[PDB]
Symmetry: C3
């Protein structure tokens, strides 16, 4: 039965394309609000990717925690996060890769997750995160103008869901995205 043989080769092709510098890097930022709703920002791009946003009070519902998820093509050692005491004393970012846990399905890494809670005093949070594709040629700058174009070509998506259950059933599962829910259940699709 060759239907089986061809399918398994095709997954190996997909992995090698994703691990090539033509593979995308994807990042998701989940903001968990006091009313149980979830805001998600997703950005997808080539070479590197990042999100910078202010999560403010909503319809008031307040943000209580954050989960950042990267696709497995990121080099976790390049992950950097900025959070916004006085300006004369601030460091531009922290390298937070060590705080990311591996999300797995069927023994394969489907993503990397950093969850953290916001102190109860907060009514909003300003947050930026950035990561670089893990391909060994990432720090060998293909032409720089190619990376400049990648910045313009990055696509951003923002959605809000009434409850995590609805995020999981109408956003995570149908799109085959990696995720870790409130009960520590893993989601995603192994290649």
């Amino acid at each position: 039965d060759f239907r089986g043989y061809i399918l398994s080769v095709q997954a190996e092709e997909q992995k090698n394309y994703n691990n090539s510098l033509n593979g995308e890097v994807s990042v998701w930022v989940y903001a968990y609000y006091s009313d149980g709703s979830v805001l998600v920002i997703n950005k997808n791009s080539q070479y590197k990717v990042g999100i910078s946003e202010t999560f403010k009070a909503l319809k008031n519902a307040k943000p209580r925690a954050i989960q950042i998820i990267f696709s497995p093509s990121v080099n976790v050692r390049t992950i950097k996060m900025a959070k916004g005491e006085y300006l004369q004393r601030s460091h531009p970012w922290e390298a937070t890769g060590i705080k990311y846990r591996k999300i797995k399905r069927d023994g394969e890494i489907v993503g990397y997750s950093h969850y953290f809670e916001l102190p109860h005093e907060y009514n909003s949070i300003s947050l930026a995160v950035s990561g670089v594709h893990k391909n060994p040629s990432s720090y060998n700058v293909h032409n720089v103008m190619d990376v400049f174009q990648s910045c313009d070509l990055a696509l951003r998506f923002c959605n809000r869901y009434w409850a995590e259950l609805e995020l999981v059933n109408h956003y995570i599962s149908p799109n085959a995205y990696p995720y870790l829910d409130i009960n520590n259940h893993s989601y995603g699709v192994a290649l």
Copy 2:
């Protein structure tokens, strides 16, 4: 009559400045909605330029087609477009320069146009396009910090018009922009 002689030299000066790396690259994205209104995004910058936007249902009126226009300083071979099936299988962009038609006035190229219709099932579209100035030194990176500054200095403009007629009379013609309307009439001003 020297009034004539000086005017013709001045147009040649303008062309050479525009074809220099100090010339701008401009891009317009026209979104044609079901109610006959038109949304236009314009960005102008040095070295390279791009737009990334989601065109969603409006006051519901739905987007039906798109026309992207670049100024004649773009290198059409560098044009790249991203459109947003599953993430594990997506290519970061397509090189779409071959689909651009030359817009001309008095036998001179005033712009490049890519028109396409959206499938009727769509209620929205996420779209990004990018192009690099055609000057031969574009891929010889002047210092890279100059291009980084150009990203900050890019100016964006967004307007919506009730009908294409009003776009053409109050936006295209008074600004001397290149355009191709619904009846395939060309607009623009030759140097």
Copy 3:
């Protein structure tokens, strides 16, 4: 009394960190509206920083003047401003560093200020400004991917205040930001 000795060394450490390429560059754009309110955009980043915004009629109240302020880590000779006659004839920016005045407190530079009024005919203004950190290694591109990440990690803040008095008392003074108010009084905190 060693409490005094340690404090003075610590300020020298802060200056050297701020003048290093790990120090931030900060920019503020103040928009002064006809109703006496003030809109402020602040961006903070490593290596270089910029703002690009359109200041439109508000709750109508119209913008009448602009003050741009950079932190003392900027190289004023790299400051560039774009303002938006016809596209075929436009220069991508002007180098405006010579128009910046030094803001000082206790004989020390706390910032650089460019104030200008808008012509009364204007109902809005589109404006972009960019500056590069003054460290001598800024034009020696650390790896370029580091600067690409800095673009993603830049944090933006936008607030509007009812009157300059409230800006000064609830935004400038509590954050120790540099400023020059309507009566030419200087604000800021010297290292």
